[PDB]
Design a protein around this nucleic acid. Structure first.
Ligand SMILES: [Mg+2]
Ligand SMILES: [Mg+2]
Ligand SMILES: [Mg+2]
Ligand SMILES: [Mg+2]
Ligand SMILES: [Mg+2]
Ligand SMILES: [Mg+2]
Ligand SMILES: [Mg+2]
Ligand SMILES: [Mg+2]
Ligand SMILES: [Mg+2]
Lengths: 131, 60, 116, 59, 172, 100
RNA sequence: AACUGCGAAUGGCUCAUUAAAUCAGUUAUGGUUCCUUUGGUCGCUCGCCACUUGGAUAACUGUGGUAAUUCUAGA
RNA sequence: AAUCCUGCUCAGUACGAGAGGAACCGCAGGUUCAGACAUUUGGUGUAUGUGCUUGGCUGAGGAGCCAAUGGGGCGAAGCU
């Protein structure tokens, strides 16, 4: 099918990113990245399209003290798109998802990286636009 | 690319569908209400001068 | 030889050169290098930066109609007949006006006869 | 001349309806049979008796 | 693709109604056969083959591709006079009505099978030619013959036998 | 000059290779980066391995070769394009004035 | 069918906002505006078409575009 | 001195009453590590390269300078 190419991650554990869905959460606090085997002292990091585990800091109180799956959809680090285009966004943002791949919300604010959209079709259908 | 041609002296404006960017580049990057040579529309159309009057986008 | 891009300053951006930037409001720009990018980020209007294409165009650095008198036919008529009629003889036209004058004279006589 | 476009000219759809328009067209100087010099369209069709009618000239 | 009036006009007939249900063990092509019949005939059914037809009335039915709730569809069609010749039963017109019921094939839904069979008068039992007679076919056959249902048998998935199994005609 | 560029230009960038000079003789284009500084002698050897994978057997057809100035952020591919873009300058105009 | 004119600012619904605000009585507009009705006034001013002018533009004939809308262009 | 994993196909297939549910060949990529490299992105930047600017100084202009690198924008090469 063609897996995603390696892209600059830039968002380690502890990053606070905006929450681009409409669930009511303002932001997300990345605590880990799925699929990271790691190294000594090397913080796990995620790029656009990676599934992470994050807890919301500002938002609806019925979600604050809980761990949720998420997917990064916009990153501020510039990454090469295998055609010389170094793309970087205005903000770090991600939507809240579940284990299967469904998106918790129903709308996405702002654009979505093409890699993230191609990885997760549900986010691709919910996306307002594709960068 | 459909190309409607209108002759003021005769009417019966016709659609010419074309498949050659090479023969459309003489119109490309120009604007409307300008006179450009229709000589790239073949030697049959050699000696023809045309002006762009209107156009339709790819969405209509 | 990809699609040709253009920076905000207007220069042609070749593939593999520069950097493309996307905003939250959906707008996507491309920059030839960090100088152009930093000007854009600091929100300097390109029309005052002397070396940009917009400046050159604004300060004009580096820098007829047709009237036709066609003549066609009229629906339900003859193209030859209409030109011939409009180029008819002036003596024919004056004969026409005098014969219509005497036609009006006999119309007046008919009016008088019906009055009587 | 390309076939179709530069040939078989259709006439103008209607005749002029203003008195000055028709007089200018026919080069009339001073009231030379303007009553009958107007265009009279003949209407013909299969299932009727074809006739002819002329517009009303104004001004 | 007919309207409701001729549907009533043939519904009032009694010698051309065929209440029958498709029954089989799990994964024997009941859904696929019913969808092929929906393509071929139908009172309003088109020839749409977008995976599973109206017999999967539920989104989770399309999610799993397992039939959950039994679906009652309607079929109408015609057959020639020499095709009527074989019909030794009562005969009225070339048109026929099929009150098709697609029953679930799982052991846990044998109650839904019973609900279908009480309505129906005949059963199309689907049997995989590769696997032969399976446990749930052995079950639903008992149910139908206890409910006095005529069985008509259909071996399915013959492509698997003749290509995947490479069975020669003698053993086939 | 590929089969899609057709530009009458040489592999030498605008203003010449940095720290090396002007390529005039033949040359070999290699995917990626090889060892050593500029103007360093390199030995090129036919492979000790049997190339049978798709990457090794992949046919290559270049569409475009960058020839902008490597001596900074180059933005013009050739002198002809740079002149067509910038247009005449003060030095050109005064050289025209001096030489008529 | 269309241009033009007129109406579409009325009617109907609801009581959210709203506490000298709305509103009732009363008083002023000699501090203003007013399609429509009616009545006035419309040769009062000395000034090569007037037996009446110019360009068009609809509607209309025709080539379409778009997935789409009471969308529209080109001649 | 290489290491391990994932996605697709196989295949909703073998197996199995069902629920579920692989593997070999192959394809596309990743993790960790290694050895390089600077075309591109980023970092540095005293090229003290070019503008801008504060205080003071050379009578003013022009041209400069000092403030332990005055500060700041952009920055070639090199290194990364
Ligand atoms: Mg540690
Ligand atoms: Mg009148
Ligand atoms: Mg360089
Ligand atoms: Mg070791
Ligand atoms: Mg000073
Ligand atoms: Mg000075
Ligand atoms: Mg001193
Ligand atoms: Mg000191
Ligand atoms: Mg810098």
């Amino acid at each position: 099918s063609g897996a995603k190419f390696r892209i600059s991650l830039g968002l380690p554990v502890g990053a606070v990113i905006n929450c681009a869905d409409n669930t009511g959460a303002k932001n997300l606090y990345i605590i880990s990245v799925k699929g990271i085997k790691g190294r000594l002292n090397r913080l796990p990091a995620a790029g656009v399209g990676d599934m992470v585990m994050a807890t919301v800091k500002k938002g609806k109180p019925e979600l604050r003290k809980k761990v949720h799956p998420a997917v990064v959809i916009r990153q501020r680090k510039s990454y090469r798109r295998k055609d010389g285009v170094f793309l970087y966004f205005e903000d770090n943002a991600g939507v809240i998802v579940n284990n299967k791949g469904e998106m918790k919300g129903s709308a996405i604010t702002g654009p979505v990286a093409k890699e993230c959209a191609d990885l997760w079709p549900r986010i691709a259908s919910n996306a307002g636009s594709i960068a | 690319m459909k190309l409607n041609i209108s002759f003021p002296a005769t009417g019966c404006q016709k659609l010419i569908e074309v498949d050659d960017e090479r023969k459309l580049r003489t119109f490309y990057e120009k604007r409307m209400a300008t006179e450009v040579a229709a000589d790239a529309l073949g030697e049959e159309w050699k000696g023809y001068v045309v002006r762009i009057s209107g156009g339709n986008d790819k969405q209509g | 030889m990809k699609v040709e891009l253009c920076s905000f300053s207007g220069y042609k951006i070749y593939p593999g050169h520069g950097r493309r930037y996307a905003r939250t409001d959906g707008k996507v720009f491309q920059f030839l290098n960090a100088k152009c990018e930093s000007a854009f980020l600091s929100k300097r209007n390109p029309r005052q930066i002397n070396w940009t294409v917009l400046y050159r165009r604004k300060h004009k650095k580096g820098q007829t109609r047709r009237a036709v008198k066609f003549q066609r036919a009229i629906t339900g008529a003859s193209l030859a007949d209409i030109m011939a009629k409009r180029n008819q003889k002036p003596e024919v036209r004056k004969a026409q006006r005098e014969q219509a004058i005497r036609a009006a004279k006999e119309a007046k006589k008919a009016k008088q006869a019906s009055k009587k | 001349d390309i076939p179709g476009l530069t040939d078989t000219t259709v006439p103008r759809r209607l005749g002029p309806k203003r008195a000055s328009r028709i007089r200018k067209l026919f080069n009339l100087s001073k009231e030379d049979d303007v009553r009958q010099y107007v265009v009279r369209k003949p209407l013909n069709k299969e299932g009727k008796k074809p006739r002819t009618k002329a517009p009303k000239i104004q001004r | 693709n007919f309207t409701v009036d001729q549907i009533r006009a043939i519904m009032d007939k009694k010698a051309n109604i065929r209440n029958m249900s498709v029954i089989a063990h799990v994964d024997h092509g009941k859904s696929t056969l019913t969808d092929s019949l929906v393509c071929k005939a139908g009172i309003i059914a088109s020839a749409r083959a977008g995976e599973t037809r109206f017999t999967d009335t539920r989104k989770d039915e399309q999610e799993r591709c397992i039939t959950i709730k039994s679906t009652a569809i309607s079929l109408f069609y015609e057959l020639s006079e020499n095709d009527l010749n074989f019909i030794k039963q009562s005969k009225d017109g070339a048109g026929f009505l099929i009150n098709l019921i697609d029953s679930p094939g799982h052991v846990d839904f044998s109650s839904e099978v019973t609900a279908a069979l009480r309505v129906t008068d005949g059963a199309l039992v689907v049997v995989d030619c590769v696997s032969g007679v399976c446990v749930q076919t052995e079950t639903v056959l008992r149910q139908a013959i206890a409910e006095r249902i005529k069985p008509v048998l259909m071996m399915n998935k013959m492509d698997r036998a003749l290509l995947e199994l490479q069975l020669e005609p003698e053993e086939l | 000059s590929t089969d899609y560029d057709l530009s009458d230009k040489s592999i030498n960038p605008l203003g010449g290779f940095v720290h090396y000079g002007e390529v005039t003789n033949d040359f070999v284009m290699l995917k990626g980066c090889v060892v050593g500084t500029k103007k360093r002698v390199l030995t090129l050897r036919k492979s000790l391995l049997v190339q049978t994978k798709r990457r090794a057997l992949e046919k290559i057809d270049l569409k475009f070769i960058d020839t902008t100035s490597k001596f900074g952020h180059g933005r013009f591919q050739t002198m002809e394009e740079k002149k067509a873009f910038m247009g005449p300058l003060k030095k050109d105009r005064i050289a025209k004035e001096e030489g008529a």
